[PDB]
Structure formats: C-alpha cells, structure tokens
Amino acid sequence: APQQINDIVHRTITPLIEQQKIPGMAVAVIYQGKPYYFTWGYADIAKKQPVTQQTLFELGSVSKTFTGVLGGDAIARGEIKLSDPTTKYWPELTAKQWNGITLLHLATYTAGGLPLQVPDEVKSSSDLLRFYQNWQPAWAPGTQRLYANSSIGLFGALAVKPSGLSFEQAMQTRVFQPLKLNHTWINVPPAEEKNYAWGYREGKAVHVSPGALDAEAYGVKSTIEDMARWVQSNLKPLDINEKTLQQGIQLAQSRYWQTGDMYQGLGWEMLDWPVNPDSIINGSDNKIALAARPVKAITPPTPAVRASWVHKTGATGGFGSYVAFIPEKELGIVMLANKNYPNPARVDAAWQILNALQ
Numbered sequence: 405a406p407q408q409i410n411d412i413v414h415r416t417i418t419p420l421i422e423q424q425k426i427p428g429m430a431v432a433v434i435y436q437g438k439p440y441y442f443t444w445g446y447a448d449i450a451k452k453q454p455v456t457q458q459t460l461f462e463l464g465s466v467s468k469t470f471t472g473v474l475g476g477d478a479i480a481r482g483e484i485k486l487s488d489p490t491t492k493y494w495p496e497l498t499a500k501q502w503n504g505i506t507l508l509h510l511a512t513y514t515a516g517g518l519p520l521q522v523p524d525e526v527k528s529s530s531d532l533l534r535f536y537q538n539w540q541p542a543w544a545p546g547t548q549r550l551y552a553n554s555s556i557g558l559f560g561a562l563a564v565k566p567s568g569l570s571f572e573q574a575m576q577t578r579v580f581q582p583l584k585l586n587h588t589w590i591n592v593p594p595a596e597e598k599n600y601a602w603g604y605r606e607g608k609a610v611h612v613s614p615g616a617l618d619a620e621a622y623g624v625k626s627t628i629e630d631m632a633r634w635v636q637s638n639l640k641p642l643d644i645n646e647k648t649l650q651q652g653i654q655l656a657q658s659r660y661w662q663t664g665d666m667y668q669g670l671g672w673e674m675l676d677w678p679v680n681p682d683s684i685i686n687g688s689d690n691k692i693a694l695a696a697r698p699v700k701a702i703t704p705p706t707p708a709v710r711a712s713w714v715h716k717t718g719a720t721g722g723f724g725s726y727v728a729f730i731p732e733k734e735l736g737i738v739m740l741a742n743k744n745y746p747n748p749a750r751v752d753a754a755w756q757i758l759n760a761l762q
C-alpha cells in the first residue's frame with residue numbers, strides 16, 4: 405500500500421482499538437478508486453481466530469444502505485413509486501392515520517414518529533398489521549425526522565411486494581449478485597459459519613437476535629472486501645452495467661430532506677463537502693441521542709451531489725460499523741468492529757483518515 409495510507413490508518417486505528425477495548429477490527433480505505441485492507445485482533449477470542457479479509461461482521465444499521473438501494477432499484481424498474489401511498493402496497497392498512505403517508509416518508513423516517521423498534525412480541529404477519537394499524541403518529545407526515553427501524557423496515561418489505569420476491573430473494577438477485585458481493589448475507593449460511601465473527605458485549609460473545617423486519621433494517625452481515633466493493637459501487641455508479649441498479653444507487657444518494665447541515669437519502673445520509681466535522685462529532689448530528697428534528701422538504705430532491713460526504717453508521721448489540729465516502733475525490737472508508745462503541749469515536753477516526761488523504 406501507499407505509505408501515506410498505511411501510516412494514517414495505523415496511527416489512527418491503533419489507539420482507537422486501545423481506548424475502546426475493541427477485540428477485532430477490519431478497515432478498508434478506497435483511494436483513487438482502489439481498495440486497501442487492514443485488520444487487527446480477533447474475530448473469536450475463545451478460539452483465537454484472527455480478523456481477516458474474509459471475516460463476516462454484523463453491519464447493523466449500515467444494512468439500511470442496501471435497503472435504500474434495493475428500493476431505488478424497484479423505482480427504476482417501475483415497480484413502485486416513492487410518491488405512492490403506503491396503502492397502495494398494503495391495502496389492509498385501513499386506519500385513518502395512514503392517509504397521506506407515502507413510501508418516501510417510510511424510507512426517510514418522516515412518517516410522523518414511527519417507533520425505533522418493531523416490538524419483540526410481533527411474530528406473525530397479523531401481529532405486524534395490528535402494530536402498524538394501532539400506531540398513533542405524533543406529527544403530520546413529512547414534518548419531522550425520527551430515526552426508526554419500524555419505518556425503513558416497512559419500506560423494505562413493501563418495496564419488494566410487486567416483484568413477488570421475498571426481501572432476501574430480491575436483495576440477493578438484484579443487488580448482491582450483480583455487484584459480486586458473494587460474501588454478503590442476510591442469513592449467514594452454514595458454509596460461512598467459520599468466518600462469522602462473534603460480537604462482544606460486556607465480555608460475552610453474542611450474535612444479533614432474530615426480529616420482525618430485521619433483514620430490512622439491520623440484518624446484513626458482510627466482509628471487509630465486500631464492503632469495499634459496495635463503497636466502490638456507490639462512489640462510481642456509472643461503472644455498473646445493470647441500468648436499474650445504477651439508477652437505484654443514484655436515487656439512494658438523492659437529497660430528500662434537510663436538517664441543519666445534514667441531508668437524508670434512502671438509507672445513506674449526506675453533507676456538503678468540504679465538511680465541518682463538528683456537527684457529526686460533537687453536535688446535532690453525532691447520533692448519540694434519539695432526536696426528533698424538524699425537516700425542510702427538498703422539492704424536488706437534488707440528484708446525487710458529487711461533492712458530498714456520504715455516510716452511514718451502524719451497530720448491533722455486539723458490533724459497530726461505519727462507512728463514509730466522497731464521490732468527487734474517489735475516496736472512501738469502511739470500519740467494521742466486533743464491539744459496539746460510541747458513534748462520535750468512529751466518525752472522529754474516519755474524518756482523521758479521509759481528511760489526511762483528500
């Protein structure tokens with residue numbers, strides 16, 4: 405690797421691992437479109453398995469970027485429209501409060517205060533219908549952003565309905581396969597078990613628990629190589645041969661809403677580059693609090709802006725992940741760890757690395 409990359413990565417990540425007591429970590433830096441890999445520590449402490457380029461990590465909420473792109477692909481295929489009422493694709497959602505709530509609102513956490521989690525008690529499709537029927541919005545649709553797995557989760561489930569495919573089937577055939585993400589999974593197959601890192605929470609080895617709409621929201625597991633490829637695809641969508649997928653990526657990076665300096669995409673989130681990193685490290689967009697923020701509609705959405713800091717953070721009980729890239733500069737980073745640690749620390753490291761290389 406170029407020595408500048410080697411040096412900035414090792415000098416930034418090594419103390420991060422110390423400070424945060426992270427058992428294992430993988431990092432990819434995309435520089436001038438080409439990936440460079442770095443690993444530390446252990447995928448499995450008890451069995452002394454090292455982190456490698458083939459180690460599978462739980463992406464947690466970084467999964468939403470895949471959901472956003474799959475949804476974008478569905479729009480490009482003419483199967484759904486983001487302007488469509490939720491009830492067009494779920495006719496049994498007859499409750500009044502659903503009047504005026506569109507697929508756009510679900511995809512961007514702006515439906516009017518859908519809760520963070522689908523309750524663990526929801527097990528059947530009937531249970532799921534009752535949950536959404538009984539939910540009472542705090543705000544009119546398209547006025548406030550409140551991060552919610554129940555929001556984008558429902559978007560994901562509904563987006564695939566016209567295809568007749570299950571969410572998994574659609575993600576595999578329309579996103580993973582075409583992009584050659586052959587070590588990226590919604591359900592980790594037995595063949596890949598040996599590569600699946602354990603997450604660590606309070607010293608215990610843990611994997612993510614199953615839940616309703618888990619696949620759509622926080623269900624993807626992937627290697628550092630595959631995540632690098634994902635970043636490459638998002639940095640330069642025009643190099644992708646499948647036309648609906650290329651368009652899907654572009655739609656996911658469009659700017660639909662603004663809060664402060666932040667713009668909400670489909671899964672992806674964006675800030676204008678050059679970035680003042682204060683808001684994403686210390687301020688209103690540092691992701692520590694669950695925050696209800698008034699949004700200003702971008703009418704219509706600005707197409708993918710090349711000079712953007714495009715990013716998503718993610719966690720599960722036992723994992724922490726971060727992805728950021730700057731299309732203009734052909735530059736990106738992926739950070740995967742098998743311990744959940746604070747988002748501001750993750751963003752601080754990513755900024756330090758990318759700012760040095762930009």
Ligand SMILES: CC(=O)c1ccc(N2C[C@@H](C(=O)O)CC2=O)cc1
Pocket residue numbers: 520551691692693694695
């Ligand atoms: C305290 C808490 O449960 C909590 C849950 C989710 C979040 N959010 C809100 C999201 C965001 O604001 O970007 C991301 C994220 O993890 C923040 C706090």
